[PDB]
Structure 1
Amino acid sequence: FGVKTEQEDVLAKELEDVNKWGLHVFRIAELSGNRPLTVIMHTIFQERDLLKTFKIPVDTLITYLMTLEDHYHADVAYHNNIHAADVVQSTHVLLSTPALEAVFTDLEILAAIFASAIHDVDHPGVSNQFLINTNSELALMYNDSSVLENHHLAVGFKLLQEENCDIFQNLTKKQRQSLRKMVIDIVLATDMSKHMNLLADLKTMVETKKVTSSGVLLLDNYSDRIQVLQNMVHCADLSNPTKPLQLYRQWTDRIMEEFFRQGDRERERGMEISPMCDKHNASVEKSQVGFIDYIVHPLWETWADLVHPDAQDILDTLEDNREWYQSTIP
């Protein structure tokens, strides 16, 4: 035909919000036939001219993206392809913040976006500790240390070896070694066990923050550049409470479903039920308020400082949503 179907047109129209915080990611998931990660990644790669810059064949990119997306679990309520697509898209927006204009190279941009896409791939919907406590083969392989995060990376990279999936086939060895290091550094930093140190270092950078004559941040060395990228993607991963409440609440429903399911498995097995995984002793609203007060607000406040005043609306929304959950505590 050569013209879009009406569903494809409606999808294209939704994708016009790809550069906006609060993209209707769940509608995109539905409209795309459960291919939000593929369609959002493809849109972002085109928008950023990544295919031309890195000589990525388009069929190779689509094959890889579908393969990656296929290895997110459809039965996992939160850590699935919709979450991945959300984190990609959120990272995409954070990358284009005025305070960061012309700071990152195309390869660093590629790293952050690719890292976002793969960062939860093959997540079983249970915690590292559950995998450790059950003596899972995964935990055995990874010595109980960032078990899932190591796995997400290993899977993300391994899938490049499937038929016509090597999207990095035209990168030089130098580009590939650099890209790989950055991707690993970013995804391993998504382990919540690393949050406090990641935030401490972000704070230290905001303390010593330097800005150019152009007004954007100055990042001289790899340590500062990767730290900002790690924190950016970590912010994207922890961005749900900063979204419009209609979106945020769907994420809360999902994380609670995933948590309660793990709790049910723990109970079944006679294991102690992990924090916030007990459907019979839950405080969904109190827990979101605590999540925000102790983890998300501290991070986003510091990010908002780093990129002042770019993230002011995101922070305002976070505080509005915090107050809404607070107001709903029974």
Structure 2
Amino acid sequence: GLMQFTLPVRLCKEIELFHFDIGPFENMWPGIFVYMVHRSCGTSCFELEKLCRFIMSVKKNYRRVPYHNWKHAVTVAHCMYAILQNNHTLFTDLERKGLLIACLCHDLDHRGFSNSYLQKFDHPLAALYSTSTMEQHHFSQTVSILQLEGHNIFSTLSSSEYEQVLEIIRKAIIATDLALYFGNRKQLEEMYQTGSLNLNNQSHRDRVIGLMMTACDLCSVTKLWPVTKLTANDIYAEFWAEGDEMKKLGIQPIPMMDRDKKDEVPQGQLGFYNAVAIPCYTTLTQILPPTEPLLKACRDNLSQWEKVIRGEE
């Protein structure tokens, strides 16, 4: 009741910034997440006992893969926390509750392989879910954990509030399928520019929350250069293992996944920053101006990748 989570001073101040790194001490990540729910939502949003039991079951259903792991989950939630705290008055009580949970849960039981590899391997999940294969699985794992005894953090919601929060989480998690991002951003670009964009239109909120989910998901490109660069090593460690597996099925992987194109990594980052990251944070900054520090940070890491190509590192 009268129990606030607090953080040491450097974390208490830096967690409020977009570029915060949750650090290498795993055992502090649950408390960092609770701290963020408390300040973003309130000490009354969730019963502490249920929340803690929920957090630990979520942690236990993330696997020890190089990138799509528990650290990524808390990282993506911290970015959402930053967006929600800098746009306080734009979001409902249900959205605040639902979106940090969605971020923690958005990659549950990831195996380090893309939807494409699941479809080429012919994995059972690819028969159950023809599109956004892993993302329907992640939402499925979230509902499972919510239904374990002592884990219903939403137990105090009405029947219809419950259904609205699970529907926010489902759409938030689906939107993390980057195949969906391009069209979603295009539509938001056009609606913003013709001034049709309308935050009372629920289908418009849906798209804006979807672009926030892509922004939070890609936030490794918005960190200090040493964090960005070392995270890229984890990202490629998965993609190259996927490349190896593709070759094992008798298939040339795409260049992104072929460890024989290690030398081309700087140029692949440029493409990625130009085709995905920069457009993502641009459109987000237009729609929510106080998210601009993500665009500024993204542009700085693009310069760092340009510097790498030029031999300046």
**Does the alignment reach a TM-score above 0.5?**
yes
3-state SS, counterpart of residue 257 of structure 2: coil
Give 1:237-276 correspondences, 5 Å limit: 237-276=217-256
Q: Residues of 1 paired with 2:278 and 2:40: CA distance?
A: 30
Q: Give a deviation string over 1:219-266, Cα, whole Å, max 9, x none.
A: 212112222111111111122212211221122111011111111222
Q: What is the CA-CA distance between 1:320 and the residue it aligns to? A: 1.8
Conserved? CA contact 2:99–2:172, under 8 Å: yes
Structure 1 unmatched runs, 5+: 1-7, 211-216
Q: What is the CA-CA distance between 1:267 and the residue it aligns to? A: 2.2
Q: What amino acid maps onto 1:242 in structure 2? A: T
Q: What is the CA-CA distance between 1:277 and the residue it aligns to? A: 0.9
Q: Which residue of the partner structure matches residue 141 of structure 2?
A: 155
Q: Which residue of the partner structure matches residue 320 of structure 1?
A: 300
Over 3 Å counting, the alpha-carbon distance change for 1:95 and 1:162 in structure 2 is: same
The one of 18, 38, 62 equivalent to 1:21 is: 18
Identity rate, percent: 25
Conserved? CA contact 1:209–1:306, under 8 Å: no
Q: Residues of 1 paired with 2:239 and 2:295: CA distance?
A: 26
Q: Which residue of the partner structure matches residue 272 of structure 2?
A: 291
Q: What is the CA-CA distance between 1:323 and the residue it aligns to? A: 1.4
The one of 49, 54, 63 equivalent to 1:59 is: 49
Conserved? CA contact 2:40–2:84, under 8 Å: no
Conserved? CA contact 1:84–1:118, under 8 Å: yes
The answer on 1:116 being equivalent to 2:110 is: no
Q: Residues of 2 paired with 1:152 and 1:189: CA distance?
A: 12
Over 3 Å counting, the alpha-carbon distance change for 1:171 and 1:105 in structure 2 is: same
Q: What amino acid maps onto 1:229 in structure 2? A: I
The answer on 1:188 being equivalent to 2:159 is: no
Q: Which residue of the partner structure matches residue 117 of structure 2?
A: 130
3-state SS, counterpart of residue 247 of structure 1: helix
3-state SS, counterpart of residue 328 of structure 1: helix
Q: Residues of 2 paired with 1:177 and 1:307: CA distance?
A: 27
Q: Which residue of the partner structure matches residue 286 of structure 2?
A: 305
Aligned length: 304
User: Quick check: 84-93 or 38-47, which moved more?
Assistant: 38-47
Say which structure is richer in helix: 2
Q: Residues of 2 paired with 1:12 and 1:120: CA distance?
A: 29
The answer on 1:106 being equivalent to 2:101 is: no
Q: What amino acid maps onto 1:168 in structure 2? A: F
Q: TM-score, normalised by structure 1?
A: 0.86
Q: What is the CA-CA distance between 1:121 and the residue it aligns to? A: 0.8
Q: Give a deviation string over 1:79-102, Cα, whole Å, max 9, x none.
A: 1111111110001111222xx331
Q: Which residue of the partner structure matches residue 95 of structure 1?
A: 84
The answer on 1:46 being equivalent to 2:38 is: yes
Q: What amino acid maps onto 1:31 in structure 2? A: F
